[PDB]
Design an enzyme around this catalytic site. Structure first.
Site, PDB file in Angstrom:
ATOM      1  N   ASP A 183      30.994  40.692  44.029  1.00  0.00           N
ATOM      2  CA  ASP A 183      31.634  41.396  42.924  1.00  0.00           C
ATOM      3  C   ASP A 183      31.772  42.879  43.283  1.00  0.00           C
ATOM      4  O   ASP A 183      30.858  43.477  43.872  1.00  0.00           O
ATOM      5  CB  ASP A 183      30.840  41.222  41.631  1.00  0.00           C
ATOM      6  CG  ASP A 183      29.422  41.713  41.758  1.00  0.00           C
ATOM      7  OD1 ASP A 183      28.617  41.029  42.430  1.00  0.00           O
ATOM      8  OD2 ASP A 183      29.117  42.785  41.193  1.00  0.00           O
ATOM      9  N   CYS A 217      37.299  34.875  38.603  1.00  0.00           N
ATOM     10  CA  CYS A 217      36.046  35.298  39.188  1.00  0.00           C
ATOM     11  C   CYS A 217      35.071  35.369  38.019  1.00  0.00           C
ATOM     12  O   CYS A 217      34.922  34.390  37.295  1.00  0.00           O
ATOM     13  CB  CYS A 217      36.181  36.627  39.931  1.00  0.00           C
ATOM     14  SG  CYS A 217      37.335  37.806  39.186  1.00  0.00           S
ATOM     15  N   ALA A 219      35.025  38.331  35.645  1.00  0.00           N
ATOM     16  CA  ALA A 219      35.878  38.927  34.623  1.00  0.00           C
ATOM     17  C   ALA A 219      37.326  38.415  34.722  1.00  0.00           C
ATOM     18  O   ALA A 219      38.099  38.501  33.777  1.00  0.00           O
ATOM     19  CB  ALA A 219      35.843  40.433  34.741  1.00  0.00           C
ATOM     20  N   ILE A 221      39.613  39.643  36.867  1.00  0.00           N
ATOM     21  CA  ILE A 221      40.511  40.754  37.175  1.00  0.00           C
ATOM     22  C   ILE A 221      40.335  41.367  38.580  1.00  0.00           C
ATOM     23  O   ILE A 221      41.322  41.732  39.196  1.00  0.00           O
ATOM     24  CB  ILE A 221      40.373  41.883  36.125  1.00  0.00           C
ATOM     25  CG1 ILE A 221      38.949  42.444  36.099  1.00  0.00           C
ATOM     26  CG2 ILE A 221      40.784  41.382  34.737  1.00  0.00           C
ATOM     27  CD1 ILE A 221      38.763  43.516  35.015  1.00  0.00           C
ATOM     28  N   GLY A 222      39.104  41.479  39.086  1.00  0.00           N
ATOM     29  CA  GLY A 222      38.859  42.183  40.350  1.00  0.00           C
ATOM     30  C   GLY A 222      39.256  41.383  41.590  1.00  0.00           C
ATOM     31  O   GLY A 222      40.332  41.581  42.183  1.00  0.00           O
ATOM     32  N   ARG A 223      38.366  40.484  41.989  1.00  0.00           N
ATOM     33  CA  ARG A 223      38.635  39.531  43.055  1.00  0.00           C
ATOM     34  C   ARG A 223      39.856  38.650  42.729  1.00  0.00           C
ATOM     35  O   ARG A 223      40.658  38.359  43.604  1.00  0.00           O
ATOM     36  CB  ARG A 223      37.388  38.676  43.305  1.00  0.00           C
ATOM     37  CG  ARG A 223      36.216  39.483  43.871  1.00  0.00           C
ATOM     38  CD  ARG A 223      34.868  38.767  43.743  1.00  0.00           C
ATOM     39  NE  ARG A 223      34.353  38.775  42.371  1.00  0.00           N
ATOM     40  CZ  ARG A 223      33.153  38.309  42.014  1.00  0.00           C
ATOM     41  NH1 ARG A 223      32.336  37.790  42.929  1.00  0.00           N
ATOM     42  NH2 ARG A 223      32.761  38.371  40.740  1.00  0.00           N
ATOM     43  N   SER A 224      39.996  38.233  41.471  1.00  0.00           N
ATOM     44  CA  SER A 224      41.152  37.447  41.057  1.00  0.00           C
ATOM     45  C   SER A 224      42.459  38.209  41.282  1.00  0.00           C
ATOM     46  O   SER A 224      43.437  37.643  41.754  1.00  0.00           O
ATOM     47  CB  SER A 224      41.041  37.051  39.577  1.00  0.00           C
ATOM     48  OG  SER A 224      40.033  36.058  39.394  1.00  0.00           O
ATOM     49  N   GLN A 264      39.839  45.973  41.095  1.00  0.00           N
ATOM     50  CA  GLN A 264      38.825  46.774  40.427  1.00  0.00           C
ATOM     51  C   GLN A 264      38.270  47.958  41.220  1.00  0.00           C
ATOM     52  O   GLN A 264      37.615  48.813  40.645  1.00  0.00           O
ATOM     53  CB  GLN A 264      37.686  45.854  40.009  1.00  0.00           C
ATOM     54  CG  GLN A 264      37.954  45.213  38.676  1.00  0.00           C
ATOM     55  CD  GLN A 264      37.920  46.232  37.572  1.00  0.00           C
ATOM     56  OE1 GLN A 264      36.871  46.799  37.292  1.00  0.00           O
ATOM     57  NE2 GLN A 264      39.076  46.505  36.964  1.00  0.00           N
TER      58      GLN A 264
END
Ligand SMILES: CNc1ccc(-c2ccc(C)c(N3CC(=O)NS3(=O)=O)c2)cc1
Ligand SMILES: [Cl-]
Ligand SMILES: [Cl-]
Ligand SMILES: [Cl-]
Ligand SMILES: [Mg+2]
Length: 300
Positions: A183, A217, A219, A221-224, A264
């Site tokens: 993350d 992932c 949240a 938003i980041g990795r996704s 992110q």
């Protein structure tokens, strides 16, 4: 030759301005209302207080009761590919999650996190880990069975059978589980990331004949966001067979019209460039590079 995105990448690296470039994207990003997400009755359907689907792009569950799930349809018109981005389901929303997979006719689920990260539960255990212990989601009338799984050194691919207990119709769902992406972090290399992405691609899960692939992932938003940005950019490049027609920052801004906070950190943005630049080799006809990635990723 030298792609325009490669020249841009070198200039940004040189001036050391990934933070500035990334923060400008944050400042320019769309702001749309999330009024449904913020209704009191939906408080316990949200993993993070500050990560909500926009109303205009949210996925609606087909149930007169409460149609809310924390999930967004990212519809990339120019690229002609859609993704559903969603949070890691909560203990009380696993039924909803599989309901969404059903109603949206998704064939593939992409998971970019682990259930436990940094001592904390970032995602419910929403799929069965043993063949003989299937899951029944009573609230949404769905049955989920582990059919088989192929475990590699840093990702796992699972065949699941999803059954609508109301009609007794069954579907094969493919689960692509990236297990080593921290993350707020980046994959180990462009190779490992692209090897995984191409595994998702090869399965047929991204075909327009299917519903949108579900990507999450913790949240969502980041990795996704990183996964989808890379894939969309490679697809745009692919359609035109023209890498220099791809504006990665512009594509990211377009994606952020459909869900907030996609990508992110500055380094995830930087990594997105690396993945697209490297993946361009395959797109433009270096077919052997896919084997290189496989070897470099050390999946065995
Ligand atoms: C807008 N505010 C906000 C931003 C981010 C988060 C948040 C929390 C926990 C995690 C694991 C992640 N993720 C970082 C990553 O790289 N992927 S992630 O799961 O989306 C994001 C919560 C609130
Ligand atoms: Cl896990
Ligand atoms: Cl841990
Ligand atoms: Cl959880
Ligand atoms: Mg067993």
């Amino acid at each position: 030759g030298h792609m325009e995105m490669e020249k841009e990448f070198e200039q940004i690296d040189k001036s050391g301005s990934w933070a500035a470039i990334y923060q400008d994207i944050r400042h320019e990003a769309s702001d749309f209302p999330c009024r449904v997400a913020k209704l009191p009755k939906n408080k316990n359907r949200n993993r993070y207080r500050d990560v909500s689907p926009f109303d205009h792009s949210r996925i609606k569950l087909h149930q007169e009761d409460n149609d809310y799930i924390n999930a967004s349809l990212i519809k990339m018109e120019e690229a002609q590919r859609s993704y559903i981005l969603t949070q890691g389901p909560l203990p009380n929303t696993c039924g909803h999650f599989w309901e969404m997979v059903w109603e949206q006719k998704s064939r593939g689920v992409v998971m970019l996190n682990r259930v436990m990260e940094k001592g904390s539960l970032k995602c419910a255990q929403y799929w069965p880990q043993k063949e003989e212990k299937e899951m029944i989601f009573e609230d949404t009338n769905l049955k989920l069975t582990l059919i088989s799984e192929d475990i590699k050194s840093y990702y796992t691919v699972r065949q699941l059978e999803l059954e609508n207990l109301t009609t007794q119709e069954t579907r094969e769902i493919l689960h692509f589980h990236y297990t080593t992406w921290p993350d707020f972090g980046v994959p180990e290399s462009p190779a490992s990331f692209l090897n995984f992405l191409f595994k998702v691609r090869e399965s047929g899960s991204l075909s327009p004949e299917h519903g949108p692939v579900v990507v999450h992932c913790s949240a969502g938003i980041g990795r996704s966001g990183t996964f989808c940005l890379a894939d969309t950019c490679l697809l745009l490049m692919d359609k035109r067979k023209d890498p220099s027609s791809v504006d990665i920052k512009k594509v990211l801004l377009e994606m952020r019209k459909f869900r907030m906070g996609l990508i992110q950190t500055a380094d995830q943005l930087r990594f997105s460039y690396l993945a697209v630049i490297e993946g361009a080799k395959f797109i433009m006809g270096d077919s052997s590079v896919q084997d290189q990635w496989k070897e470099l990723s050390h999946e065995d």
